[PDB]
Amino acid sequence: VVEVPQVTWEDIGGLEDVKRELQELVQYPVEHPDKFLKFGMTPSKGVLFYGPPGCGKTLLAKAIANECQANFISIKGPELLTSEANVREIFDKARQAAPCVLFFDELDSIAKAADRVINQILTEMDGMSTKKNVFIIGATNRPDIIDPAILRPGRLDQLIYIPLPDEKSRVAILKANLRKSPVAKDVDLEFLAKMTNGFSGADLTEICQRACKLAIRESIESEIRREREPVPEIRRDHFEEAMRFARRSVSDNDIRKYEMFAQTLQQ
Ligand SMILES: Nc1ncnc2c1ncn2[C@@H]1O[C@H](COP(=O)(O)OP(=O)(O)O)[C@@H](O)[C@H]1O
Ligand SMILES: O=C(CN1CCCC1)Nc1ccc(F)cc1
Ligand SMILES: O=C(CN1CCCC1)Nc1ccc(F)cc1
Ligand code: NA
């Protein structure tokens, strides 16, 4: 399906510099048109996100579409395998759905036939002006095998690191998830953040989902019992039980590999 996503910048904890950079990348062409005309600036054709799984790459792509009130089309890397015309088709449909964000997920899979699924993607990108109002986003968990051809001027304009959340970002992720939830006053999310070093955004969200269901299931059984004979909160003891089912999904060794890649870039 194609639609304007409902996720916003507010649903995304941490990454405040990245969000700043992205909002400008898409707000300046429409907020400062005369300056873009005066100096010969062209809008960006897209960006490439890299980092460990479950830390916000997909969320940021949907939030860019929501900011621009644009349709969102998601394409999974391994699904381009059945046929070089499939890269042709998907760009046609993005063009038809403009203004549109076209998101290529799981691109590390293509980087390992597949050699000109790539060549067709690079072809479709060069033959699409920015006046077509399609914004391309790719994401990968394997930055070491990126073909630098995709980052040349005229294709994806910047490579952006989305890291595991630090302690402050873990508090923000928890708060954004629970933004519209009835959390008990005995709940200390800053202590929860301190006990989840190494957790991804997805790992933290699973704790929140488990704790919400425990409170709902408890509410069901309490009312069943009272009928023999006031919104209920998610309490500290629901989070205590939910943390029993929790552990990181990204190993210490992969984390070292991401940090080396980004530090050597001076990024
Ligand atoms: N920065 C974040 N803020 C809030 N929730 C997050 C964040 N990162 C991940 N999540 C949670 O984990 C899920 C998966 O994140 P996603 O962006 O799909 O990861 P990926 O980086 O692999 O694209 C999100 O739907 C959300 O529930
Ligand atoms: O992440 C892996 C390997 N993982 C193991 C389980 C799934 C894939 N390698 C890697 C990570 C970051 C980097 F910059 C270079 C290489
Ligand atoms: O870190 C680098 C260096 N490059 C320099 C310019 C950009 C980064 N490579 C690398 C990192 C992890 C890994 F698993 C394999 C290779
Ligand atoms: Na990922």
Swiss-Prot record:
Residue positions binding ATP 2: 54-59
Record PTM N6-succinyllysine, positions in chain: 185
Key words, A-Z: Acetylation, Amyotrophic lateral sclerosis, ATP-binding, Autophagy, Charcot-Marie-Tooth disease, Cytoplasm, Disease variant, DNA damage, DNA repair, Endoplasmic reticulum, Hydrolase, Isopeptide bond, Lipid-binding, Methylation, Neurodegeneration, Neuropathy, Nucleotide-binding, Nucleus, Phosphoprotein, Transport, Ubl conjugation, Ubl conjugation pathway
Chain positions with Phosphoserine modification: 219
An MF annotation (GO) of this entry: ubiquitin-modified protein reader activity
GO cellular component, one term: site of double-strand break
Entry's family note: Belongs to the AAA ATPase family.
Function: Necessary for the fragmentation of Golgi stacks during mitosis and for their reassembly after mitosis. Involved in the formation of the transitional endoplasmic reticulum (tER). The transfer of membranes from the endoplasmic reticulum to the Golgi apparatus occurs via 50-70 nm transition vesicles which derive from part-rough, part-smooth transitional elements of the endoplasmic reticulum (tER). Vesicle budding from the tER is an ATP-dependent process.
Protein name (database record): Transitional endoplasmic reticulum ATPase
Species whose genome carries this gene: Homo sapiens (Human)
Gene name for this UniProt entry: VCP
Parent-record interval covered: 468 to 764 of 806
